Amino acid sequence: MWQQAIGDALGITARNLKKFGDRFPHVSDGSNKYVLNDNTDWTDGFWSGILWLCYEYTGDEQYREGAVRTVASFRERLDRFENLDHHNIGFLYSLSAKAQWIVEKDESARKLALDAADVLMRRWRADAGIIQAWGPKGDPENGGRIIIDCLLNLPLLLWAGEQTGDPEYRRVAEAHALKSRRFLVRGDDSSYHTFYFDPENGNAIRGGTHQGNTDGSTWTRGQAWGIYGFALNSRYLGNADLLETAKRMARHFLARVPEDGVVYWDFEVPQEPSSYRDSSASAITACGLLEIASQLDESDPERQRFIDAAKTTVTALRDGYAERDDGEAEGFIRRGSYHVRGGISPDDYTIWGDYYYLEALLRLERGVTGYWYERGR
Numbered sequence: 001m002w003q004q005a006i007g008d009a010l011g012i013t014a015r016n017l018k019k020f021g022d023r024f025p026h027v028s029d030g031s032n033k034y035v036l037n038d039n040t041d042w043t044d045g046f047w048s049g050i051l052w053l054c055y056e057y058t059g060d061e062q063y064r065e066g067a068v069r070t071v072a073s074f075r076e077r078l079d080r081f082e083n084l085d086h087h088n089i090g091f092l093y094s095l096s097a098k099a100q101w102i103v104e105k106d107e108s109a110r111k112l113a114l115d116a117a118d119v120l121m122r123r124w125r126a127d128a129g130i131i132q133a134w135g136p137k138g139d140p141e142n143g144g145r146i147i148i149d150c151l152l153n154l155p156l157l158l159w160a161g162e163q164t165g166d167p168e169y170r171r172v173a174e175a176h177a178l179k180s181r182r183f184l185v186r187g188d189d190s191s192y193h194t195f196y197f198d199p200e201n202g203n204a205i206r207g208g209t210h211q212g213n214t215d216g217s218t219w220t221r222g223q224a225w226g227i228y229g230f231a232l233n234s235r236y237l238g239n240a241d242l243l244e245t246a247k248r249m250a251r252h253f254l255a256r257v258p259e260d261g262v263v264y265w266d267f268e269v270p271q272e273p274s275s276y277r278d279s280s281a282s283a284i285t286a287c288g289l290l291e292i293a294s295q296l297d298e299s300d301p302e303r304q305r306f307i308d309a310a311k312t313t314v315t316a317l318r319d320g321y322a323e324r325d326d327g328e329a330e331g332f333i334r335r336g337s338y339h340v341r342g343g344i345s346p347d348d349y350t351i352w353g354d355y356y357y358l359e360a361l362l363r364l365e366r367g368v369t370g371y372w373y374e375r376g377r
């Protein structure tokens, strides 16, 4: 039921590794070809994650070799602090270094992940009680701004805390998760993309976005980050409130899935065929649904409902958005959107969309849960 979908991803990935060399895919821009970078963006870890997933599925060393090479690249990136002045250190190092530790217990990889966690820890702003999303400390406009995607960067910190025994990691992570729950999540179970607080005292200012249609709309990838993010933090923290929030956001998302099963870029714009989609939001949500289900009691009827929703989502992606390995295509699923409002790759491959699509497939076919936490954690 999932073997052919995975087959195409494996073939595309093998072809990509040879063509990309040491470079990393980010997004496409109007074609079936990925635009590459020299490990300088916030998405490079997704490539590493894809390679590790392919390796876990096949046992084929070609994927391992590629992943190991990206890990070496990340060692270099960390040691010269290249473009790491943001909270996406988790996206970058959980899926590469921590991933290798999870896959084969590589000690050097574990150390690299820990070193990265250390850097991310310094993004914490005591006076605001939040992890600064972007920019340097005291940034005039982003000094007290949190983004919902930060929830997916907390796993690196939580994992490091359990590895070192240092309670500060869990302390800042839970504080940030709870603050996110109170101010980023809305009363109708939708969510704001970002939220601003007074850098001095941490007072709540306003919710807003530069990506969603409007400050009060519902950017689908944002909602998706919330679904998977809150579920990942709930697992680590054993916090029933965060799990409940993940479920609430999931139901809100599911109630607004269009006819073909894959979401538009924002729930509050006309849900019309000519509008941009965001297949990556659906891929992320598929993973979040499975993560939520994995935390529910087997006697909870909603558990299977979420598992079925995830399967339906992956099937919808496979049927109407997945690329077949035709020897040319470089992405797994079409129609992801990076920055619609900015006109940046609004109908393209997104490496994160590809990673989550594959993670969902590996979860369904092999029970492989990605690299957000230890297997059995």
Ligand SMILES: CC(=O)N[C@@H]1[C@@H](O[C@@H]2OC(C(=O)O)=C[C@H](O)[C@H]2O)[C@H](O)[C@@H](CO)O[C@@H]1O
Pocket: 042, 086, 087, 088, 133, 134, 135, 147, 149, 150, 221, 338, 339
């Ligand atoms: C916020 C930041 O540090 N940089 C901005 C980008 O923020 C990233 O956005 C996304 C996303 O699109 O899903 C995920 C990451 O968690 C988040 O840090 C933002 O995407 C771009 C515009 O697309 O502006 C900044 O680079």
